[PDB]
Amino acid sequence: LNPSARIMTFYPTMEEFRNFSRYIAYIESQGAHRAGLAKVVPPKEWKPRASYDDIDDLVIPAPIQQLVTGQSGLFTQYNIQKKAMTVREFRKIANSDKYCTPRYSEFEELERKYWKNLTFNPPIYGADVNGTLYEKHVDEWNIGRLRTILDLVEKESGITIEGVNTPYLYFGMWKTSFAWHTEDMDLYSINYLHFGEPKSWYSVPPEHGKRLERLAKGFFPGSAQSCEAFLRHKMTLISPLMLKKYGIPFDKVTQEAGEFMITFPYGYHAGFNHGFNCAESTNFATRRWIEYGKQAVLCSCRKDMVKISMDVFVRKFQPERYKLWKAGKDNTVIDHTLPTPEAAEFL
Amino acid sequence: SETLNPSARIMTFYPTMEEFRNFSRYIAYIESQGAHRAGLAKVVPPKEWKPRASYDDIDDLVIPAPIQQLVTGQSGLFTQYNIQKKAMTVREFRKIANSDKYCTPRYSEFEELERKYWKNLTFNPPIYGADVNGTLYEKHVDEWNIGRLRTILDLVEGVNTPYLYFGMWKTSFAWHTEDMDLYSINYLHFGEPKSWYSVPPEHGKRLERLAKGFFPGSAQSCEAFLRHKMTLISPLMLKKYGIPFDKVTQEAGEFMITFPYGYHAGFNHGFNCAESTNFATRRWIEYGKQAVLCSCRKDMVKISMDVFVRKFQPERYKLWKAGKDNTVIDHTLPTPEAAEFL
Amino acid sequence: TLNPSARIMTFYPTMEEFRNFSRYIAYIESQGAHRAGLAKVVPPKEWKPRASYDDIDDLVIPAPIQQLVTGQSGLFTQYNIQKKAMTVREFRKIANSDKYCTPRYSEFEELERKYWKNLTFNPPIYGADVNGTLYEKHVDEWNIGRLRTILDLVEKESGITIEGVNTPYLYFGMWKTSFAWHTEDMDLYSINYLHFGEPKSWYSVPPEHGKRLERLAKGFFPGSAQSCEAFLRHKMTLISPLMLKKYGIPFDKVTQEAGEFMITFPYGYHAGFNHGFNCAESTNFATRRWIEYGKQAVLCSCRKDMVKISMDVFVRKFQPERYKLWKAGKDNTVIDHTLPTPEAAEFLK
Amino acid sequence: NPSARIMTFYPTMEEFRNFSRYIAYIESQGAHRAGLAKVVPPKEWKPRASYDDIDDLVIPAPIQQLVTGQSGLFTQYNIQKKAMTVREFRKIANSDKYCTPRYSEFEELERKYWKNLTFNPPIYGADVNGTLYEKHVDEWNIGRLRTILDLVEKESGITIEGVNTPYLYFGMWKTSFAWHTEDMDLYSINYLHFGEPKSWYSVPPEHGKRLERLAKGFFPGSAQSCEAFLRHKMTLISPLMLKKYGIPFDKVTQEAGEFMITFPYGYHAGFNHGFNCAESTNFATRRWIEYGKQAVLCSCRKDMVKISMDVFVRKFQPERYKLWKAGKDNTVIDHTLPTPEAAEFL
Amino acid sequence: XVYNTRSGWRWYT
Ligand SMILES: [Cl-]
Ligand SMILES: [Cl-]
Ligand SMILES: [Cl-]
Ligand code: NI
Ligand code: NI
Ligand code: NI
Ligand code: NI
Ligand SMILES: [Zn+2]
Ligand SMILES: [Zn+2]
Ligand SMILES: [Zn+2]
Ligand SMILES: [Zn+2]
């Protein structure tokens, strides 16, 4: 619900595509980050992997059955762990009659069916599977090695956070969904849909993020009192009709196989898989993210939640502020419209 | 035998203190009145009888594995998923159960509360303090002691141990028979009622057929999929397909008895504690021999019937071991122990 | 003059002599067999009560009894511990195992010595008192299911069924399983056929000397005697032959082998043990001579479930003249244990 | 090894009152090392004024004790007999056939016991639910010792007869209890209310394992059938046999009015001198928890006593809980160490 | 995963 808040799609050339961080800076020079979500279609020649035939014996350690409870466009999703299985067993179940995609003509019908049947026939989600489907020799947009400043966490701190600085794989089926959330530490996220059916996304522009959580707080007051950042549990589903009803600007975009999805700092997003598919995702950062990292409201109710020490980042990139920030006197106000400094080359 | 309880309706018994004292003998008696044909029966013990003097010392009782009951479904067909939660005390459980979020809704007539249950089943998933190893009976109580009924089920070489159930509003038990098609005894110590649905054993197959029709995937994955205790079917749905069933509400101080191959289901009206165990009579042995068991899980409850066949059907042991004991169960027939009442 | 020594007699009937069981009992009594209290009858080799014993492994022994024995100096008491039902297969695996199998021995006397030496050690299991028969239906000769003696009148007229008395009992034995000194219930006759397996050894006190054994037993177990008039009927009392010799009780020994019958006669005290795994079938039967024993049999008073047969029907049918005297209580007939059964007249002519 | 010999304690009334504390004290003195200890209560303390009003008390399942064996190795079979009153039981017990034999020194009676074990099976009025303690006695009340064992009833409500409830035992001459540790290798308390003495044999917990091995060697069949066949309480081993195979042991006679404490993993056996009545139950301390975790239980019977250790581990060993539930808890028990509660007495 | 209990299939996440 705002012209600069609309999701942009980008069609780089192979030459534009090579330097990932630089292309992120470019799309931010173009205002992409204001939608909180952006699509990047890689050049037709580019592939991260020659074939997906060898993955059928790949194991999904902890498939998740997504049980959704709720009504009136407000839902809570519970992730029930299932027996490990291969993507062959997963694909069988996904393509079976009980879990296959419904028959539809236009996306809007599939969306209506998603929100109508959300709480029925809980699908299984092969989510959070460690590993990459990139071949190790692919230097362009390798989710396994984006070479972003986020690397400072593993390089300097020695901390490995699975899914954040490591690649995650997601085997989806119809009605498998991801709840409204920003990334851990309000980082950037990258999502590549390797193969299969599309993943539809909803995005709330970061400028309106506080409004969304506000709405969420009003509708899940128990969850809000238990935890300030309860949306970080990734259990909260809110329908587009509720967003529209409460004046939350949002946009929707559908990601097809072979396409990239970029999530920008503090960009709340949600969505669902049309059917059987496989996506790879990880987090990344830019200089712009550092401030977000400093100000990210995190989950207080679980000890295992992702928390990154911002020390190394402030020290390296905001030396003048380090002591000030360590003193708790860094009162910088984030401007969600501003592009990342690396985009000055394009301005 | 078919002349007794022809209706197959749930019967209620009001034994005097001397009729009540011998539990096994009384099970045989209520079977001599045809109670077993409903698959479910109520026994109101004499007011003088109390298993426990008071229930004010159970706040420290620990529920090791409370389960949040997520329900998915519509049109009277649901699947329940029991999610293990963090251990809590009965005091903690009572505080949640009675809280605004989870407490019983306002209602005047039972049918209203039933309507609300079937309407809101999928929302605000409650916590069931179920399957707690324990008893609220005092040691000295020798009548109807669920902890030690001393039926032939003790011969198994724990189905015969006591289990406590701390319910809150719209906590449910799915349609099922007992493991090994055994008997069930359920005593409501205190608190709000527990409503029960039951299908006469005579018509159990019909329910199964209906169930298999509505969950073909589950049935393909497991013949006895109802034994997972995840399948909720509303009474309106049973009535729509002409499946005979009965309902009965159990109140504090009351015993419910489920009989071999009696399908039953139900829900708790609010915070309560029940205590139940399985038991057997000689009639059960054939049921045990013929019970269709859950194929798909290695840790399902499976009792070897061998000791029972030797001890109570020696003449048939060989035949049974050769897979050739094709006795047909007559669900109307009382347990032989009922002879003295016939 | 017939069988003065009162020693156990063995018989080898031909198939034609064999047919009529009751008649053959009359015959062996004509020969004084009853005076030993125990007699062996070897059936003709053509005769078999069952074609094979291959199909009984899954036959259930409802109440196997582990026999604990306490005592010393040839005087023992046997306590039966009931165990859970087991099959003949399981029983045989136990019986033939190294723990319970027959020990190695040269001559019978050695095995008898080992029995009385190890009687109290390593208690064996006895597959005793099993309701059933291993006779095939077609067998009409010496069918322990249907001996058709006068005892049938208990079930026919009086309508009374007594397991092991009216009906057949099977017995699966192993090494040093014992039966204690006793007479039959109601001082009846006994028939014991060893279907298969290892021998069963028997001790027999002549009925003429039964009162002597009793008197000895009462002396050795004074408490038991005070508690019950016929405490030997509990079948717990084991008395070694050396004690019978030491106190001058006449007795005889006989070893019964597979395919052989043992008849015990009214008021014939007997005991014994099994050499190893075997199966025996027994029941009680009667002749007119038994009636006087039944009328006079001293019975267990201490147990409410002990076997008692109403003798009225028998006296009415076979002693019509005496009923009123006997019913009055002045029928002081005195049994002569040497006199054969009346049915033996034709064999004494 | 007096460090591992049975000790007798004579508490004053003030130190008698807190039972659990006094157990901690006798542990501070090393009583637990013997596996068995005697506690003579104050002379003024009495659990019950008179014992003449219990003649009509029913012994539901009196057991006749048939013993088979030789050369100091025996197996005891318990034949249930018809229910009888204390009156009937004592009549038999004091009768001519079952009375105590004539003897001068204790060793003579022990000799007669082991010589006549397999003869004249006595009747043992054992495992009688009930207490002879008068209601208003708050010291060493076997019905309610208030030890941490109570936690299992406090969290589940489950009771196990004779373990967390009292048992009465009416013994006569030659009635014996076989070599065993308590269920779950718990503590045991035994109070001889009245009557003739009870003799005890104790093997120090340090050497308990050796006893097991020895028993396994003598009853290989029984040891193949059950991991812990001694828990059947059927195995009688004469002291001569223990000495021959070098099993350290001690013996003590408990007179009437005397307490015996059995310590975790303390094997003990013995016999009653004549007609008597004892009351016993189990109890625990913090030290017991590890024993309970490592107790080798009977694997061949479903009726065997099993206590869930989760309550105790979670409450008193949170630090090890995750590892213990994981199966990574490799604590090795020092049977010498006293209970942490003994901290007061060094 | 899942384990079987008297009351059904219990899912321990
Ligand atoms: Cl809430
Ligand atoms: Cl299905
Ligand atoms: Cl005697
Ligand atoms: Ni995301
Ligand atoms: Ni049930
Ligand atoms: Ni006989
Ligand atoms: Ni003990
Ligand atoms: Zn949180
Ligand atoms: Zn199944
Ligand atoms: Zn008697
Ligand atoms: Zn065992």
Residue numbers in the entry:
A (entry chain D): 8 to 354
B (entry chain C): 5 to 161, 170 to 354
C (entry chain A): 7 to 355
D (entry chain B): 9 to 354
E (entry chain E): 1 to 13
Paper text:
Histone lysine methylation is dynamically regulated by methyltransferases and demethylases (KDMs).
Interestingly, the structure reveals that CP2 occupies the histone-binding groove of KDM4A, but not the 2OG-binding pocket, the latter of which has been exploited for most reported 2OG oxygenase, including JmjC KDM, inhibitors. Moreover, CP2 exhibits a binding mode, which partially overlaps, but which is clearly distinct from those observed for H3K9me(n) and H3K36me(n) histone substrates. Analysis of the inhibitor conformation revealed that CP2 adopts a distorted β-sheet fold with two turns; a type 1 β-turn (Thr5-Gly8) is closest of the two β-turns to the active site metal. In addition to mimicking the positive charge of the lysine, the guanidino group of Arg6-CP2 is positioned to make hydrogen bonds with KDM4A residues (Tyr177, Ser288 and Asn290). The Arg309 side chain rotates by approximately 90° relative to the H3K9me3/H3K36me3 bound KDM4A structures to accommodate Trp9-CP2. Analysis of the polar contacts in the KDM4A-CP2 structure provides a structural basis for the selectivity of the cyclic peptides for KDM4A-C over D/E.
